[PDB]
Nucleic acid binder design. Structure first.
Ligand SMILES: [K+]
Ligand SMILES: [Mg+2]
Ligand SMILES: [Mg+2]
Ligand SMILES: [Mg+2]
Ligand SMILES: [Mg+2]
Ligand SMILES: [Mg+2]
Ligand SMILES: [Mg+2]
Lengths: 195, 119, 98, 129, 81, 86
RNA sequence: GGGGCUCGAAGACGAUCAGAUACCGUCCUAGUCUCAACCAUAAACGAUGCCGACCAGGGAUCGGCGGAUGUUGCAGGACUCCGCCGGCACCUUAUGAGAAAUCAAAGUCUUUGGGUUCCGGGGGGAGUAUGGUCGCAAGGCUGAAACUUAAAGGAAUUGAC
């Protein structure tokens, strides 16, 4: 939709809050810091960063080899959907090592794209995707390494509202780009927020 | 000692996974069902399996465990899709904006958003 | 083979540091190298405090503390279980226990 | 102390090039540095570069295009005639197909192929390929 | 590269990273390739895309995201957005 | 802040060089200035250096203006400060 | 020359021990302290010469300075936040190096060249012989050869203890 609605929604979802510090990356994404030390990461850049991520992910027309991963047990609900709204697969919680490199493993599945809730939590799939030419997209926050993730959306991954609202917004614009959502409104009222 | 071999643990888990419909709480009913729903050679191995299954029914009658699956709450689906309120949890008015975020909305954003607040 | 980055002591930016004497064997050890502890204890322990409470003339007498900074050489500290031998990866862990 | 500003310039440029930087800063500047950079740019190994006047010694901001593998000075500036160029080519260069040696001949600062063209010799400044 | 006839002599021509221009080795398993699709004025994916390649070095550095973002901002100008 | 790959060394931001060391700026510039200190009374035209080192006086009562310190000269509370520039 | 508390090479005695000129006890001499002169060595160690440039991030700390800030039984001082220069260090990670331990320098090295001083050439003989030279002496600086030998050594690995 219009950027104003999404911006005000992530303002409602408190996606602009940062942490006490930042790494030497993401200063291209922060706006400044509050007197308490928190960061106010500029949602404006986040909007078209996730928009370009959406442009990236509707480009392969075979959504089967798109695993969404979430090691933290707080955004599992959001990753549970976004896998039947689109055709992507989604592994939640535990990621057995070898699923991207061990071709004798029962869960061997090499993707064309990886979507990750937070580079800090599930770093193991990042390091394993480094051995298979797997492009990676993650919702990095401040204090999150850029070590191998290739497209990083500057959002919050520690909030009930941030995750969920952000995932739904991404999926909404992806379906819009695919053409299924002809100009209209939301039919996916917030369900991914934690119980 | 009284710890259970991986074979009896596994077979108890499988029989509960595929035959939770009729199997009951009493040990003797569990063994008289096991003797025909599966082929166990040693009678005392069958007794161990039946007692273990009874113990896990005691475990599960209070809540779900990490072992079994199918009908994936314990017996019936549709647990969380029903948690959809008639109004979204995300409000749009007077939405949690502070001084530095006000300075942001003075930046590229629109300072006259519907949810702007002086907090 | 260098077991430790700091050499087992805490010297940087200086050349000399006066020694102390181990409280058990009276062996001269550099002040920064010696294992130093600060122990603070009641003069009388729990089995004794009960019997000294009523024996005290007035109830307003708070029981006195005692404070002692003790220094141990490496040999005495290891033999007295003040500091144990740790694994190679846990050696770098400088976090105090609890 | 700073005994050869050309070495500092070339080393900083090479270090920035290895790290994938798109711009590099060189301080202090000098005419010989400018001539070396001009030769490198003419042969198509770097791009734009601008000299900034700080009223004392000047700086250079150079734009990299990723085409430069190595570049470095030779110290001390040995004297080479026209007949010795081949030998130095066999030492400082990967292969006879490409690469360049920079000479400060009395006709100016040039590469070794141009020196052979003009049949002139001189001292060796550095090399780049 | 080029023979005196004027024909190819090497087996293949490699890819080079779109950020640092250094080439991509046949055994570079951290090197990736992203196709960014384009949309129409309404916002419909039209089936054409712009292709970028990133070598393992730039990825392992952690500058892959910044380099790709800069490349996209620069490239979208010619082909609109 | 990936690295200088996003910024331009030729045209760096105009505020980041307000904080770097004076020698380390793109072009070296002084951090000081000259100010015409105005006393409470008349004789308000005296010009003093910001990082002054001598205890200047005034023709009227010698009206001690500034004390030299490790940095900017300590102007008195009674003396008003305004700056002159190029 | 003075001083001479304590401690304590040498020495004596007790104890242990197959033996104990040692470890354990006690008494102690030179010494330990100081003044005027000599010596010139240490695991004198960061086992890492000095000067210069560049190349990742982070927080803490010491000295100085610039700015903001709002409290002190009191402009300034104490405290909080940001930044710059200089220093002692520390943490994470190589895309670097290395035989490795490990190192943000021990990196920018067969894609080898910024300047300069000292210094090594398998292990012993040996820092020995002799000469020279400084010192009251103990000793210091410089410093071989005959002969002998196939290993000596560094880092890490698995066992055994
Ligand atoms: K110690
Ligand atoms: Mg040892
Ligand atoms: Mg010092
Ligand atoms: Mg010393
Ligand atoms: Mg010596
Ligand atoms: Mg300070
Ligand atoms: Mg030898």
């Amino acid at each position: 939709s219009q950027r104003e609605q999404d911006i005000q929604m992530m303002l409602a979802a408190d996606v602009h809050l940062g942490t006490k510090n930042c790494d030497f990356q993401m200063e291209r994404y922060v706006y400044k810091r509050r007197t308490d030390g928190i960061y106010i990461i500029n949602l404006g850049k986040t909007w078209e960063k996730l928009q370009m991520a959406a442009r990236v992910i509707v480009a392969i027309e075979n959504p089967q080899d798109i695993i969404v991963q979430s090691a933290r047990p707080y955004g599992q609900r959001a990753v549970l959907k976004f896998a039947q709204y689109t055709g992507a697969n989604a592994i939640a919680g535990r990621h057995t090592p070898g699923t991207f490199t061990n071709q004798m493993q029962t869960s061997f599945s090499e993707p064309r794209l990886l979507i990750l809730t937070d580079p800090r939590t599930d770093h193991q799939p990042i390091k394993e995707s480094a051995l298979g030419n797997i492009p990676t997209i993650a919702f990095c926050d401040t204090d999150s390494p850029m070590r191998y993730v290739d497209i990083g959306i500057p959002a919050n991954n520690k909030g009930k509202q941030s995750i969920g609202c952000l995932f739904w917004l991404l999926a909404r614009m992806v379906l819009q780009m695919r053409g299924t959502i002809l100009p209209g409104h939301k039919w996916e009222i917030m369900v991914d927020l934690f119980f | 000692g009284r710890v259970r071999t991986k074979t009896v643990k596994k077979t108890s888990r499988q029989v509960i996974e595929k035959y939770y419909s009729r199997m009951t709480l009493d040990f003797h009913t569990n063994k008289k069902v096991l003797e025909e729903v599966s082929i166990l050679q040693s009678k005392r191995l069958r007794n161990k399996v039946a007692g273990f299954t009874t113990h896990l029914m005691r475990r599960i009658q209070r809540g779900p465990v990490r072992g079994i699956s199918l009908k994936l709450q314990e017996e019936e689906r549709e647990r969380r899709m029903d948690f959809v309120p008639e109004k979204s949890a995300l409000e749009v008015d007077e939405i949690r904006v502070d001084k530095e975020t006000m300075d942001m909305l003075a930046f590229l954003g629109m300072a006259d958003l519907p949810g702007v607040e002086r907090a | 083979t260098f077991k430790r980055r700091n050499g087992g002591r805490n010297k940087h930016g200086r050349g000399h540091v006066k020694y102390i004497r181990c409280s058990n064997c009276a062996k001269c050890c550099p002040k920064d190298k010696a294992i130093k502890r600060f122990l603070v204890r009641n003069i009388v322990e729990q089995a004794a405090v009960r019997d000294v409470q009523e024996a005290c003339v007035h109830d307003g007498y708070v029981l006195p503390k005692l404070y002692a900074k003790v220094h141990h050489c490496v040999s005495c500290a290891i033999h007295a279980h003040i500091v144990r031998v740790r694994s190679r990866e846990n050696r770098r862990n400088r976090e105090p226990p609890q | 102390v700073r005994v050869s500003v050309l070495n500092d310039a070339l080393k900083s440029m090479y270090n920035a090039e290895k790290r994938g930087k798109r711009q590099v800063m060189i301080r202090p500047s000098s005419k010989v540095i400018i001539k070396f950079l001009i030769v490198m740019q003419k042969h198509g190994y770097i791009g734009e570069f601008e000299y900034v006047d700080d009223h004392r010694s000047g700086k250079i901001v150079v734009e990299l295009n990723g085409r430069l593998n190595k570049c470095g000075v030779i110290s001390p500036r040995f004297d080479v005639g026209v007949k010795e160029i081949e030998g130095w080519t066999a030492r400082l260069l990967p292969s006879r197909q490409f690469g360049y040696i920079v000479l400060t001949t009395s006709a100016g600062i040039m590469d070794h192929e141009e020196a052979r063209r003009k049949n002139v010799g001189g001292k060796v400044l550095g090399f780049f390929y | 590269m080029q023979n005196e006839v004027g024909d190819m002599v090497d087996l293949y021509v490699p890819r080079k990273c779109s950020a640092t221009n250094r080439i991509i080795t046949a055994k570079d398993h951290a090197s990736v390739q992203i196709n960014i699709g384009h949309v129409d004025e309404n916002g419909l994916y039209d089936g054409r895309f712009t292709t970028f390649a990133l070598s393992g070095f730039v990825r392992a550095q952690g500058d892959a995201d910044g380099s790709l973002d800069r490349l996209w901002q620069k490239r979208k100008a010619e082909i609109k957005q | 802040m990936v690295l200088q790959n996003d910024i331009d060394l030729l045209n760096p931001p105009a505020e980041l060089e307000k904080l770097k060391h004076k020698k380390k700026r793109l072009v070296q510039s002084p951090n000081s200035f000259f100010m015409d200190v105005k006393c409470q009374g008349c004789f308000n035209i005296t010009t003093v250096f910001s990082h002054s080192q001598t205890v200047v006086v005034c023709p009227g009562c010698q009206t001690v203006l500034c004390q030299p310190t490790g940095g900017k000269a300590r102007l008195t509370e009674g003396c008003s400060f305004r700056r002159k520039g190029d």
